[PDB]
Amino acid sequence: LSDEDFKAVFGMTRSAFANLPLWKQQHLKKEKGLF
């Protein structure tokens, strides 16, 4: 995704998301059909 699309889809910035547990980063993304 682009950075703007990322923020819309996940409801936070990439930097914020990077603080989530790694396996979950995978969870919030696979659940959206993303990688």
CA distance 19 to 11: 14
Rg (CA), the chain: 9
Resolution (Å) of this entry: 1.0
Question: Is the domain defined by 1-35 classed in CATH 2.40.10.120?
Answer: no
CA distance 21 to 8: 20
CB 7 within 8 A of CB 13: yes
Q: What is the DSSP letter of 19?
A: T
Q: What is the DSSP letter of 33?
A: T
Q: Which two tokens stand for residue 32?
A: 């959206």
How do the domains of the chain map onto residue ranges? 1-35
Integer CA distances (angstroms), 22 to 17, 25, 28, in order: 9, 5, 10
| Four-point Cα dihedral 5, 11, 14, 19, nearest 10 | -160
CA distance 5 to 21: 21
Cβ count within 10 A of residue 12? 14
Cβ count within 10 A of residue 7? 15
Determination technique used = X-ray
